[PDB]
Amino acid sequence: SKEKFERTKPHVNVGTIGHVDHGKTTLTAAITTVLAKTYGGAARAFNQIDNAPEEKARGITINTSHVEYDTPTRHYAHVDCPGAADYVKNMITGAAQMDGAILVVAATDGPMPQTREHILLGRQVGVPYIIVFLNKCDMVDDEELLELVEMEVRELLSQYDFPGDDTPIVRGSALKALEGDAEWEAKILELAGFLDSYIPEPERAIDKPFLLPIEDVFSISGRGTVVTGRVERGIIKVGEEVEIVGIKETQKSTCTGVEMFRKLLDEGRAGENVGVLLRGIKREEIERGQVLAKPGTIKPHTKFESEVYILSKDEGGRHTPFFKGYRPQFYFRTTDVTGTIELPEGVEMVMPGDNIKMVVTLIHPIAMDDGLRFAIREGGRTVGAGVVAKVLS
Amino acid sequence: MVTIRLARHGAKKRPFYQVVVADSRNARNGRFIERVGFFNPIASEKEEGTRLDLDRIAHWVGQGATISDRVAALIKEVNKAA
Amino acid sequence: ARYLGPKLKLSRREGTDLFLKSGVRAIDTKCKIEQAPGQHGARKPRLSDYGVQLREKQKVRRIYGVLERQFRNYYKEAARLKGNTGENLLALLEGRLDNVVYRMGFGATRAEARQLVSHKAIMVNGRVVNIASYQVSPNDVVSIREKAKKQSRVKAALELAEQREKPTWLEVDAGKMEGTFKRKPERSDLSADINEHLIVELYSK
């Protein structure tokens, strides 16, 4: 916290996606070192990304570790999700902010079970565009075998609603480009070109009132409690009133300071990932899941009508009916919450692969409006997405 | 150093300066030997406004004591024969 | 600050006319006066020593429009002052501006006189005053400014002052809506009904 971040170049929220032990932290670490040397960004290393006793004794990503690197045209803000079966909740918070993704497949193994589950989760939340990166290559010195894997990735995307053949499948090692090989360094500089060319400049909302869903809370020793998250809409100013709304109850506060990757900001606008400092609030009372709205706009609710689209075996969901009393997990913006379903009159059962309305009573109150969407999950697998119809409370 | 100076008493936005003889080291509203009238800059053309005992100033200044920037003006204000 | 509720209900609880709902009309006889405080008005009170003291205080409050925190501070002032404590209480209550404006005739009811004072209509010694509790010292000249003077909630109300007793201690011009508060109010002049003795008891303990 020292340098004022000057607002040059359009901000793009990027993140990696992939299977476990399949290239991801190494991919980001290579992007950090390569873009530092040629284009003249900040250095950093692979050690600073993933850290602590829990992510070393095993050697896996559990929390969402972020990076900020720059190119001539645009400015990027990377996110490394955990990619594993047990940590799928905190993966969704990183994936929700992401506009243009970097999928990671491997030329040795190929497609894996969670590579399918990641892409299935992304569309229901909000991932318009996606790029593939074959992160091994050099392990198999053969032209025929490597190109057979390229064919399999186009099938995954085209089956599950995407361009498929139009998506640029770049190839190359991360470990060779990390240390400094001239042929492999330039092949990741080519991926930087595809991030600019393929993914467009995302359209932000700088008009409708201020909102900020919290992905993860912090406690800076000196200043107080800080809350990170993408500014989903509107603008923030250092001094304005900020009514916290969500789980538990509803608190009043003021914005002490906005920052972007340990650098100051006056006007933190919509689209970019910023960490807002609060006035006289503790680490205990503020929870991961709540939202920072402008006073008077949004109101907390725990009962709502919604036209939910349940999925069948073809898309990816259930294969059996269910009566009232069913309690799955609802993923609104960032965090999950349980809720009992109440079906309408003249509706005995809910078959899979059907379009119906339903009143859902949540256990906690969460803020919502008419137009918002979510993705239901239960039993380590998806159920179906929907859209909010009417507020009831 | 003993000095004849204003103490500043009164309410917020409505001050009332107790002109007073105290040591320089001592605080604004600290100890003093004794007072010597008062000053008020928010009286207007009415009965009362400012006071200054001219006999006590001749005692302290005759012995040895400084007169502050504002109290120097109040000795000019009362005049000798004007 | 004020009661702002059913006014004529408060006259039935005490029984006597508190001058609340007086106005342009002379006498009410349009509320079942005396024998209907609430639902159970057919009931008759036994009334203890605390009761008789409390009902007297409660009556003198609602006549002048004063609340207990403000009223208790009026009592403490009377205890300090010399002479009879009872006659000093009523002297201070009469010394309010909203009460003096009511006695002048510039206001048909006391709530009208209170709001007429509040809305920058009442002037006194050339100074505009908005406070009902303004303690009016003797030898004053209360008056209405030319904006509020000769409007249609004053000339109608001033005709009621002809029917009224008209106190000795003050004078009214009734030409250019001008007033003259002459001296302080004496006990023997006003009241002649409401008890001062019982209120002095209640607060002494």
Added chain:
Amino acid sequence: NIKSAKKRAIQSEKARKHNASRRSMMRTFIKKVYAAIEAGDKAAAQKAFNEMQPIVDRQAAKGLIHKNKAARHKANLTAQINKLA
């Protein structure tokens, strides 16, 4: 420290070297008189006394020694000389 008025530290150190040199000098000329005292005439003590008498007053006027200290140091030491010798 976090101040540019640390000049007083290096000034006081530069002072106390200068101060303690003259301080010690004074109290050896005093001890030189006490060497004559015990077994000596009004001559060995007096010559030593007339050497320290000018130096102790010059110290007293400087402000290192406080002139009352000098007033003792002559008086209380002359009482040794005048009585015994």
Added chain:
Amino acid sequence: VTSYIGGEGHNLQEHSVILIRGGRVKDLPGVRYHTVRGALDCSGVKDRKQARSKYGVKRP
């Protein structure tokens, strides 16, 4: 200490962090405190229209 839990129906079970005020009951021998309702984890009693400063309940 032992604290009397007022109202009809309560949230407490084994643990749960609760605010305690003073006030003997004059009924149970030894219980010399009252558990405050509304404060922290002991929530308000359901459907109490009259007297709701005691028992920590809001307006309808």
Added chain:
RNA sequence: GCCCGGAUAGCUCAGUCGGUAGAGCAGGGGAUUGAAAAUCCCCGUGUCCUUGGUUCGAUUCCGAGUCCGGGCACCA
């Protein structure tokens, strides 16, 4: 953010390694009493913490939560 443990009728507890839930104490109904106790005659009075799956069938097999318990970390 993640690792673990805990939850069986109103309270205190057996139960199981797939066959449709028990024990004691309590409580309810009837006769007596103004009402109880005892005395006499009859009753489990259950969302096996909640909810889905593997099964013809699950407290007991496997997921996902609930609040609570304790443990380990990150620091715009």
Added chain:
RNA sequence: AAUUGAAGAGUUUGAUCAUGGCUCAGAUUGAACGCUGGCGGCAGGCCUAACACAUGCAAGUCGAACGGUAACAGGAAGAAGCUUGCUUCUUUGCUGACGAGUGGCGGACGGGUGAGUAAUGUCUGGGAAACUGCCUGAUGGAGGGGGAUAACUACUGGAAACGGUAGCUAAUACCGCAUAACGUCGCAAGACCAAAGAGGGGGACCUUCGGGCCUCUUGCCAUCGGAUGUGCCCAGAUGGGAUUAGCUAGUAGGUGGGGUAACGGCUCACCUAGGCGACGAUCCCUAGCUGGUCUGAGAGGAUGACCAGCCACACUGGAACUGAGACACGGUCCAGACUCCUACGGGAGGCAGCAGUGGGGAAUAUUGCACAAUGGGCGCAAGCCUGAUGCAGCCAUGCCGCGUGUAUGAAGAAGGCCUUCGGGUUGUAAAGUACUUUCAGCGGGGAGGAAGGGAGUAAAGUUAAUACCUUUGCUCAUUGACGUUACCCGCAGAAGAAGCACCGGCUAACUCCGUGCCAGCAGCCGCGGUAAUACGGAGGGUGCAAGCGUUAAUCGGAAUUACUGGGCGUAAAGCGCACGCAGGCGGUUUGUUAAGUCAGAUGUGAAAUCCCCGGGCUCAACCUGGGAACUGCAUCUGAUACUGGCAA
């Protein structure tokens, strides 16, 4: 013009009167909590961990201390490019200014916090053996040289903090020499002791053209002063415990030497074996003290947040140094603990200054703006410094003011609630017609806080002088953080603006349903067992109302620790009974006596706070002028009945 003040009730019983606890009504708080919230004014806002701290920020300042024009910006003698005044550029204290660092003076104040401390402290009243910087009264002097020594080079050590060697240089830093006296010492004669120049301007004379010389300003050392300080000493007062009874060896006192600014076991050396203690030493626990605050009719009881005086402390323990003054909050040196840094050699730092953090907790705020005023530091001044302060935000946390319409309004409408179904009641409440526009919303006028400083101009002082300098009028240009200020005017229009306790008795206020010793209430007595005024809900009522209750806390009521003001035959309470030391108390007459006693006198009883009368915020809180008050305390002079001494 300065005191006009004292209430009771419930509760032992079948009932009574006692005794006696328990409970309640009232004030108040740095309060919290729960339910609710519109504004303005003035106050307040870590009581617990004196637990731990990231970040910024709280003390600097002068060229009027002298070299150096070390940097930077102007001018001026001269130079080089060429659009010969447009540009390149070396010297120059002649001005503006201004250094890593040497001096002068400040940092010891101002701020913060109560860990310790039960007497070293604090309070009140006296006292002799002291010093006191700048401020300032007075009397003299203010002589002339010396060496260094940082800057500044050089060569070097280091990651850094931070050096080292060898040279050169100035002074109001430092040291001797003359010169001294009412200063110092001695019985005297004597001996001895000090300093610094800077700053503006200028006629004659004098110029080696360095200036001498005059002159004003400031500035400088010696002494008797003054004031404010500060140090020390004694007397009384200043919490609880005897289930703490004997403590004390530099302990108590002397003589001598040392030491202290000063007296003194302050400290060594003998000498002497005393000093303290039932009018409580020692030991133990708890505690900053006071003005005051709260309460009380008062005597007292509680307390010592905020405002102010004193002490004590500054990460823990210790020590001294520099200074007039510290054994030093934001100095030094050691050790310790505990965080940071590192090139692993070694070095940093101290929030019980302001903000903020975590933590503890029932619980307490912004990492704001300003030197415009008020003092504070240095300054000739210009200014610069300031989390002292003055504002602003936050928080119903207090105290107080105004709001939330106002008249008329019968079909006594509708709907709710009760019922003897006749009707009553919610209720002139509501709906309508007549009428406002505090405060909020918007746009304009707009004070008072600002006294001074800057330039110029005439006169008076000052001098050789119409010059500078010092003073006084007198013109111009100005100086505001608060600030869309206080206040005023208009604009539109019922527009934006009410809860929450209680309702058996004490204690103001009733019925109906639901439940049936269950669920629950409660401050005491107590309510609930199928007709509940006490439980839960409903309508009605009562009291408070931007507050209301609940909890805790202190006094009060409690004459329930009783001095004023209680008791002890049987209610709690006469030792089982004597003798008796200290202690308390003492028949009666005449003296004296000044201790009690009283009477007067003097100084003191800090200011605020309190009480009385005034003045000012539109009013009140709030502020403020005067007086009384500060019930006392010490001495001085009397009275001499009563108390006491020594008497007869």
